[PDB]
Amino acid sequence: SLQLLNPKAESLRRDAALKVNVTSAEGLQSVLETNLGPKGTLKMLVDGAGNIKLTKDGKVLLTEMQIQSPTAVLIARAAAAQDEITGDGTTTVVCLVGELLRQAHRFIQEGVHPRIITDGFEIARKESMKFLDEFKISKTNLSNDREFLLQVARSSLLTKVDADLTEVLTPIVTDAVLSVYDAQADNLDLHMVEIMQMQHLSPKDTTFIKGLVLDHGGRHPDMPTRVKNAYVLILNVSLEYEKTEVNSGFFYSSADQRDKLAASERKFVDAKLKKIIDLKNEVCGMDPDKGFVIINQKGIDPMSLDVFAKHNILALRRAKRRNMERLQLVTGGEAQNSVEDLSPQILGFSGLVYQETIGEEKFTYVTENTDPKSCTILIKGSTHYALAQTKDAVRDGLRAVANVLKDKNIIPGAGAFYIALSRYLRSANMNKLGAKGKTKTGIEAFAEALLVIPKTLVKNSGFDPLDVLAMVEDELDDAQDSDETRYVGVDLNIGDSCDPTIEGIWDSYRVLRNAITGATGIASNLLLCDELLRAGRS
C-alpha cells in the first residue's frame, strides 16, 4: 500500500520488523557484551585518520562508530542518557534490552500479544523498586573513612585496567573528593577537578597533587620558577589590546609626534600596570622568599613581559574559563577583572609554586594550600591512547564514588541484586496482577531476563554459568531457612559464589535505577513497534 504513495518507500510489517528489532538487539548484544566485568576485552577504535584509542565503555564505542541500523540507534541513545547523568552501567543497558527482547520474543512466537507482555514488565519494574528500597543499606559518611572509599573505587576501576595499575590509581580517585564537601547545602561539583593530558614516565607513575596545576609556563627566563610564598592575582581584561572597537587612526602632523603617539599607547599600559607594581610593595617591601604571581585569562603583551620580568613576577596567559572558579577554591583568593580597586584581602595564598620543563612546553604546579576546596589529577601515560583510557577510567570512577556522598545508600554488586530480584519476581500471588493469565507471562519474562548479567561475567572469565549458579541457588535456598540475611556474589577467580560485602564489590544506587528504567522503557517501545518505515526527499 505504501508503494502507491511513494514508489521509493519501503515497509516491513508485523514479522520482518520484529526480526529486525530482535536481531539488531542481539547483534548489538553479542558484540558489546564482552566488555562486561574485569576479564573483558579491549577494543581499538581505529578511524580513517589512524587515531588509536583503548576503552571498554559502551558510550565511546558507539559514539565513534556510527550506527546504521535504526533499532541500535535507540539503544545507543539510551546509553548516552545513561552515561550522561550517571557515567556508568552502559553495558548493562544494552544487555538488558537485548535479553528482554530475546525473552519477550520467545513468548511472542508462542502467540502472545506485546501489550500484556510490556504490562508485566512495568509491574515487574514497580515490584523491583519495592524490592530495591528494602534491599539497599544505609551507612554514615560523616566519618569519612578511607577504607570504604578505596574498595568502592577499586570495584569500579577494576573493570577498566588490570590489577597493578588499579592499585596505583585507586588512591587517586579517593583523593579527588577529600575537601569537596558541604553537609548543609549538599552541593558537590565534579567539574572542579582538572584533567591534564601529557606524556611522562609511565601510566603507573602518576600521583595526586593537592593544589592546582596549569599548562602554561613562564615566557621570560628571568622570572623565578621557584616561589616559596605567592599571592595570586586574577586578571580577565587583555593587557595586549587586540583591536579598538571604534575605528580610529593616528594622523601625525610631523615626524616629532610619531614617537610621542607611540608613547601614548605606552601610557595606558603603564597606567594599569602601575597599580600592579603598587600592589606588590603595599604588603611589604624588601621581603625575601615572597613572590607574586598573576593568572590572566586573555593574552599578555610581550612588550610588558620585561616589566614583569624586572620585578620577578610570574605571568601566565590563555587560561581556561572553568579554571577561574578553580583558582579561588584552591588558593582562597578572589576573582577580579579590572585593576581599579586592589587590596591584600582579595589576594590568595600558596605555600609552594614551581615549574618543570617537559619537552617543548612547561607546566606550572601550585601546591601547599591551607584549606583548598579543589584539586587536580595528572593523567600521565606512555602513549596517546593511554591518556584517553585513563581519562575515561577516572571520569567513570569519579561518578561511582561521588554518588556515595550524594545519597548515602549503596547497593552490593557482583550480581547480587539481579540474582536476588529473580526469586522475588517469580510468584506475584495477589499483590499486583491486573488480569488472569495475562500479566503473569510478562512477570516470568522479566525475571528470566535479569539473570543474564551474572552469566555474562562468567562467560568472560571462562567457566560454565549454569554450574557456578547452581551452588548460588542452593546457597540461597538454605539461607532463608537459616534465619540469617546473606548476600551472595560471583567470584571469577575460582568460579564459586561469594560475599560482596565481605570482599568489597559495590554498585551505585542511581546506576541500577536508570538502567532498569531506561532498559524497560526501550524494551517496551520496541516490542510495541510493529512496522518500520522510511520516507523523504533526496
Binding site: 587586540e242 583591536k243 581556561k320 574559563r321 572553568r322
Partner: protein
C-alpha cells in the same frame, strides 16, 4: 558532515560568541584565534580606501607597480576607470568606485579621464574598466550594457568583483551575504 563545519565556518568573530555557552571553549577559542588572525591580515592589507584620481606619468607606477604589491605573492587588484564626464554611465561608475572604496580597503580603486589615458581614444567605447593584478590585465571590460547599462546597481558591481577573484564568495561585506538584522531577527523567531 556539514553540520559540524557550519558551527565555525558560518560564523564570524562576532557570531562565534553565540556558541560560547553551548560549545566547548577549546573547540571555539581555537577557531576564534584563527579568525582573529585573518582579521588582522585584512587590516594590514588596508592600504586604500578612496578613489586615487591619478594622471598618466603616474600610471606607469600606480596602476602597475601596485599590481605587484610586495614584489610571498602579495598581489593587489587595481580597478582603473577611464572616466568621461559627457557620458551618463561614467558618472554612475564613479559613484560605485567611491562606495566600494569605503568598504573594500584592500582593493585599489583608480580613476583617470579617458581623453588623458590613450591617444585619441574612441569616446563611444567609454566608460572603460580595467583590472590589473601582478602587472597582468585580468579583465578589459567594455561599457556597462553587460552590467545592466543605465540601470546598474551596487549589487551588480559587487558581483563582478567576485568573478575576477578580487573578493571571496562568502565575504561578510558583500550585500548578497550581508543579510539585514531584521531578516535574521525573523529567522530566529520562526525557528
Amino acid at each position: 558532515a556539514k553540520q559540524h563545519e557550519n558551527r565555525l565556518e558560518d560564523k564570524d568573530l562576532s557570531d562565534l560568541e553565540e556558541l560560547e555557552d553551548d560549545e566547548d571553549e577549546d573547540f571555539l577559542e581555537a577557531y576564534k584565534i584563527k579568525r582573529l588572525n585573518e582579521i588582522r591580515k585584512l587590516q594590514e592589507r588596508s592600504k586604500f580606501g578612496e578613489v586615487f584620481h591619478i594622471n598618466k606619468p603616474e600610471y606607469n607606477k600606480e596602476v602597475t607597480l601596485a599590481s605587484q604589491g610586495k614584489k610571498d605573492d602579495g598581489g593587489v587588484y587595481v580597478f582603473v576607470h577611464l572616466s568621461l564626464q559627457s557620458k551618463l554611465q561614467s558618472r554612475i561608475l564613479s559613484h560605485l568606485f567611491q562606495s566600494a572604496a569605503c568598504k573594500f580597503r584592500e582593493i585599489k580603486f583608480v580613476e583617470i579621464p579617458a581623453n588623458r589615458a590613450i591617444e585619441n581614444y574612441p569616446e563611444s567605447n567609454c566608460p572603460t574598466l580595467i583590472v590589473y593584478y601582478r602587472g597582468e590585465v585580468i579583465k578589459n571590460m567594455i561599457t556597462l550594457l553587460e552590467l545592466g547599462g543605465n540601470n546598474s546597481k551596487m549589487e551588480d558591481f559587487e558581483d563582478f568583483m567576485v568573478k575576477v577573484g578580487a573578493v571571496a564568495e562568502g565575504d561578510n561585506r558583500l550585500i548578497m551575504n550581508r543579510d539585514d538584522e531584521e531578516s535574521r531577527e525573523e529567522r530566529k523567531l520562526h525557528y
